[model samples]
Target: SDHFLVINGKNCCVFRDENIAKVLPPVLGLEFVFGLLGNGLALWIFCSWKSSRIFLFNLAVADFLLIICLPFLTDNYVHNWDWRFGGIPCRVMLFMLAMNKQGSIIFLTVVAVARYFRVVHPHHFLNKISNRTAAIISCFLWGLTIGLTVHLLYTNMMTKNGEAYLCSSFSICYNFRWHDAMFLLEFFLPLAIILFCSGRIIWSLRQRQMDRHAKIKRAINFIMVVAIVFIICFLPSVAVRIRIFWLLYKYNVRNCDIYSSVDLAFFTTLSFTYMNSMLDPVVYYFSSPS
Candidate 1:
């Protein structure tokens, strides 16, 4: 029963149509404005700077690419999760979002690992790895994410609801199996890598007795900013996802008050999740090579 099912009863917690319509415009408008400004500034800074190395450049592109798609999701949310665009556009939007999300996670992990190698294993080959090598690796990671996303889309793995088809049929293919897989691949694994790298870096740095105030503070600031972003922007989504999957596995296709709670949790998590695109610009501000 965990599959999508049409039911006769009404959705209890969903806001009234009039109330939803009233609040939709301003919410999406604010989000669009914030995403545009934050991501645009990040892109500009990354592009204009001559000294920001290749890895940083690609990370900026990933963040901006995510910001570019914010309008679509904002519009979708404003429209009460209805997709006015055709299935193709809906798939495209989901694809871009996934790519940007995975890309950001991977790049952040790379940045942490780079710093760790620089600090602890200074003579390691990872340190010798050129910006060119890093660039190639980054490109490969993007390619991999795109490939996995395409496979998911082509499988027709997402589904749709019956009553609310706007521009075309509303179909969202969602598989519990794939959902679990993606959560593991995209969130947990990368998070673990980031934590390990960051822990090693901090431990290595604390042991050193060299420089005075400003320089030490600067290094600490960079590490702390990245850590904060990873914690605040990324972890909530992971926690929300865990609850979502747990609820799905337990409930099957039936509608319960529990489903409503999970739905609210999902949207709540989404609101914070998109804020990651905005927070990412701050990461650029602190981490960029001046």
Candidate 2:
């Protein structure tokens, strides 16, 4: 009988036994406490202020949802992703995480587009979109996200056996074939749209000078912060994903060795990705009408 180290009697080489022990304590501490505080404040401000309760408020709500989901992630991290919470909680946890990712992309893109329209076509129909209309749009966005991502409930989950029990791997969600499509749809498509809209907005502002300085400056600042967040926090994750795709295809056929460093880079990208949720409140604070 060939004996291998198994979490729950299945072989898993992805994480070392001490991997979660080493990394998760500090990571969860920082990610949870700070993320909760920041996003909580954003939620409070958005909900309390009449002026702030608009389209951007919807975005803040999405960010807050993501933050709310972080503690479960922290719990999993502390246990090295060994989901001790049973199956339903496991499914709910992963689904919420997926929703968080999709919602962030949707809301971030909306924010950028909102700013763009405010600057370039202030009288556009979107600007006239009332809070009720925006709320309906947010509902639609949630519906779309749930429709697109609910399929992951079936295909995106994986369980690895551990010495003591079954360990759940949330990152395994990213390992599925459909994940690539989700990545492009949820991440890059939004990014492309935002860049295009922001570009047009900036061009319009540049062509106009004097007296328009205040609105133009606010628009510029909003665009700049969104652009920076996308570039700094999200780009590496996208790049690493592409690299992982290449490595998956290249490693077996050619015996290529690009996977290790790419894996490290991917984890680093994941950290930055989480940091985006934590940092979103700051962006909202400065950009808000208050």
Candidate 3:
């Protein structure tokens, strides 16, 4: 949702909101500060104390990219729906975040699956794969991730809302289904996979009495933390997205006021999404493969 105003004899999404300016800045600021610290520490460790877990390394890279994209977005919140950076910069920031979000999502699911193979079936072929295979797989993952999110750079994201410019992927518009659908699928599909592996790993503990082994206990903890971080970071925004879709479906139109509670709910939950980068450092601890 955006600032609703009647301009040029019709309703236009004139993006401005005093209420959001106050509410959003503090959260982004906190996320920026903490995310930077957490991601930096993780990356530093990965570089200094190198490991064969290429997936966690790629994940930290994604988290670092995600951290940098936050404060730029907060500036827009501070100024209240004004895009001062013009089109190119606007798209870059949007693309950067989308790219990293998808990147993080894929690697998070990969981590879950990777750990699943080791814990659920320690002798499985997946656990015996070479480091070279994993690195090539990461390149393949990045290749597709770029393909999926590159459109944000070329798409018409910068909308002229009255006299001000607003750069946003979500707005009051019809026919933006594919983009939203892409986002929903990304979260839900990974959620299912993460949940599947997480549940199975938990069951493995009961069968093997995993408490008897330090490695198995750590594996259970790692998978649980991964699932928790994935859900906490993304579910709220996904839920809010579903709420807005249902609202649009109920009305069958976009003439209603978008500056309602859903607006705050939507943007507010995005901070949680960004919070993913901050909490991901905890995920890297189990990467030691001890």
Candidate 4:
């Protein structure tokens, strides 16, 4: 009466539900179309509009990178989680996915900090940072994320689930502890920074006696947008990943039902992750100079 299996001489839990396959592909496809168009248009606008702020431009680029990976992911889901791509391509796909995910968060955080400095500390050196400096920082963020997630390149992408194969990080091929730590650091670190910056910016706006209602309103809007993006796009996946670690630590893989639930939670949250590609353009629009 229990769902279970043996893989490579090790007993493994199975989820057997195709609900994710049914639900995720259509959503991913929809997101991909919107993300591609939104980010593509944003990129063109950033390129032509001529602004000294390269952070928004870099953020758009990061979103574009994330969007491009969606078609492959949708394809995998459409094929019922079967990966026709070979190992090298799979690694490349996963690498790009990881890189862009981190890069998007990093740039968004940078934009928040930059906005905070420009608004709250207009006399500070950070407010005077040049476009060249922003470009350099953006490059460093990309490099840092790529370096941090390099281990994912070695993780097995094609995993067997009973008789069917699934292309996911959820497979036994992953060390969940490492993934847990990485996910926490990747998502929460930036989240913490964004929150701190938002809080400080709001406090500064409130303390100032000058009538800057427009500026204060924009700051408040930015804070709300960042919080919403973090909650909707990243928080679910981070929470699910932590829960997975907790379950693994407590039950040690013997809890098939729990693991199956966690698997569903993980995939469901992952769909939200891709949704960020579309939502980030809104951030770009808001962050851009009016």
**TM-score, one value per model:** 0.81, 0.82, 0.89, 0.88
Task: Report lDDT per candidate.
Answer: 0.62, 0.65, 0.77, 0.74
**Which is superior by lDDT, 2 or 3?**
3
| Candidate number that wins on TM-score, 1 or 3 | 3
TM-score, model 2 to reference: 0.82
Residue 32 local lDDT, model 3:
82
Question: What is candidate 1's lDDT per residue for 1-290, written digit by digit as tens?
Answer: 23244322212123213333345455556655776787676667563222135666677688778767877766666666566777667667777777677787778777777787888898887767666666678778888878766744554312245555332111211234554467556767877787788778878878887767467667877787777777776677567667656765666435544555555454555555566666666665645565
* Best model per lDDT: 3
In terms of lDDT, model 4 sits at 0.74
TM-score of 1: 0.81
lDDT of 3 by residue, 1-290 (tens): 54554332334343355878898888888878887887787677662222235788889899899889887888888888887889899889999988899998899889788767877889988887777788889899999999988888767677677677778777644334567988898899999999998898899776865346777676677777778878888999889978877876675345556436776688879888888887777566435553
Q: In candidate 1, how many Å is residue 29 off?
A: 4.3
Candidate 3: lDDT of 164? 72
Better of 3 and 4 by TM-score: 3
Residue 116 in candidate 1, Cα distance off native in Å: 0.7
Error of 3 at 100 (Å): 0.4
